Amino acid sequence: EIDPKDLTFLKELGTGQFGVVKYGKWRGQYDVAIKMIKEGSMSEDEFIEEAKVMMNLSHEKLVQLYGVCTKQRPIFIITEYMANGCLLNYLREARHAFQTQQLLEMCKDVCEAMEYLESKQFLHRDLAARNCLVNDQGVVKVSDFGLSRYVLDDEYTSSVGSKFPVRWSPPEVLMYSKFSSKSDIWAFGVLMWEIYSLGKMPYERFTNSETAEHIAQGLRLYRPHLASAAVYTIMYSCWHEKADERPTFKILLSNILDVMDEE
Numbered sequence: 001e002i003d004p005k006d007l008t009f010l011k012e013l014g015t016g017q018f019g020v021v022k023y024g025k026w027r028g029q030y031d032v033a034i035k036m037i038k039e040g041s042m043s044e045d046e047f048i049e050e051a052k053v054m055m056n057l058s059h060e061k062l063v064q065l066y067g068v069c070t071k072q073r074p075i076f077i078i079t080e081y082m083a084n085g086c087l088l089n090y091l092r093e094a095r096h097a098f099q100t101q102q103l104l105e106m107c108k109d110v111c112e113a114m115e116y117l118e119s120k121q122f123l124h125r126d127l128a129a130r131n132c133l134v135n136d137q138g139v140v141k142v143s144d145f146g147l148s149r150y151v152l153d154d155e156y157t158s159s160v161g162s163k164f165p166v167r168w169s170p171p172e173v174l175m176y177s178k179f180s181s182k183s184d185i186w187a188f189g190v191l192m193w194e195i196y197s198l199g200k201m202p203y204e205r206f207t208n209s210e211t212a213e214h215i216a217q218g219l220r221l222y223r224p225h226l227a228s229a230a231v232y233t234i235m236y237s238c239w240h241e242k243a244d245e246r247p248t249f250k251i252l253l254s255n256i257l258d259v260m261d262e263e
């Protein structure tokens, strides 16, 4: 529990699932982002109990939760500040003119964070470039892990909803609501595709309904031009029709390190 007297609000960063997020300072020293949770958007009491677990998740490639303010409304969620914003928008800016080694390092940043979450048996459930952030050093960190569980908007949480992450979901999620470690693995492979595609929409010529059909047929995303055969093999391994045949994040990390050494 952070004392709100130790927060200063300085500029708006944008609006997400829970409303406005601001940039500010904590204890007159530390940059933070502060979510102001919009009334009616969150299952608040359930989140407040989970915040304890989520504060114990600490890894250099996870956007750190610093604390919450819950003895007031709106609730605040105070997190690490990531100066370069969302990875999706970052990938889409041609001025960065990334080398493929930089793209692979972004995949490795995310894979490290997800290997850590997997070790804690903790699912993200909405892993995608839009839910990763980039700091002032160009390090990519995974954000908003686990928070999908507290979203009250049915257009986001229902599989048939307009906001559901269809293009990052395996067939067993879309058909059966089967969530597991292996559904985050599937999403990771789509995220690698997004990175190597410089932020294209997965299945860019299909609708959500068509994508669900295409993947139920065994067909997959094509190799982005910037991906080598070895990088494509890694992302494609995340898309096995049988969940238990998909790698763990530990194996993915080893594969990524091998490609960095080879290429």
Ligand SMILES: CN(C)c1cc(F)c2c(=O)n(-c3cccc(-c4cc(Nc5ccc(C(=O)N6CCOCC6)cn5)c(=O)n(C)c4)c3CO)ccc2c1
Pocket: 012, 013, 014, 015, 016, 017, 018, 020, 021, 033, 035, 063, 079, 080, 081, 082, 083, 084, 085, 086, 126, 130, 131, 133, 143, 144, 147, 148, 149, 151
């Ligand atoms: C349930 N899931 C999956 C959720 C739940 C959420 F709460 C959110 C959420 O708040 N957001 C969300 C919404 C707003 C902000 C942040 C958000 C933005 C940050 N940083 C920046 C930095 C720079 C800029 C920027 O370039 N500008 C220029 C244009 O004018 C504005 C700022 C934007 N953001 C940041 O550090 N954090 C930690 C969060 C975030 C990320 O947190 C996004 C997805 C999301 C997903």
